[PDB]
Amino acid sequence: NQKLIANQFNSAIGKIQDSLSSSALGKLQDVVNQNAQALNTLVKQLS
Amino acid sequence: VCGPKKSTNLVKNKCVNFNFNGLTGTGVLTESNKKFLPFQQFGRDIADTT
């Protein structure tokens, strides 16, 4: 079934791009948002 | 009613102590591209620093 298996793999890889061009990286965006919020609170405590 | 208030002349592009009308600080003065409204005196940023 080699040709069928290669075709299924190629279309499954092609759907990852179309899912990512729409997000799904929330676990990496949370870390950035938390560190920026903590530095902003530290700086606003000087007033 | 009070006395007069003296003024020196401003120097750009080097580290000074400044005093603009009761707002003191220390830093480097440089010409800007910001445009205020004609009643505003100074600007701040997100963290409320001048």
UniProtKB/Swiss-Prot annotation, chain A:
Q: Organism's domain of life?
A: Viruses
Sequence segments annotated as region (Heptad repeat 1): 2-47
Effect in UniProt of substituting Q34H: In strain: Omicron/BA.1, Omicron/BA.2, Omicron/BA.2.12.1, Omicron/BA.2.75, Omicron/BA.4, Omicron/BA.5, Omicron/BQ.1.1, Omicron/XBB.1.5, Omicron/EG.5.1
Task: Quote the function comment for this protein.
Answer: Subunit of the fusion protein that is processed upon entry into the host cell. Mediates fusion of the virion and cellular membranes by functioning as a class I viral fusion protein. Contains a viral fusion peptide that is unmasked after S2 cleavage. This cleavage can occur at the cell membrane by host TMPRSS2 or during endocytosis by host CSTL. In either case, this triggers an extensive and irreversible conformational change that leads to fusion of the viral envelope with the cellular cytoplasmic membrane, releasing viral genomic RNA into the host cell cytoplasm.
**Name used for this protein in its record:** Spike protein S2'
Q: Which residues of the full protein are shown?
A: 919 to 967 of 1273
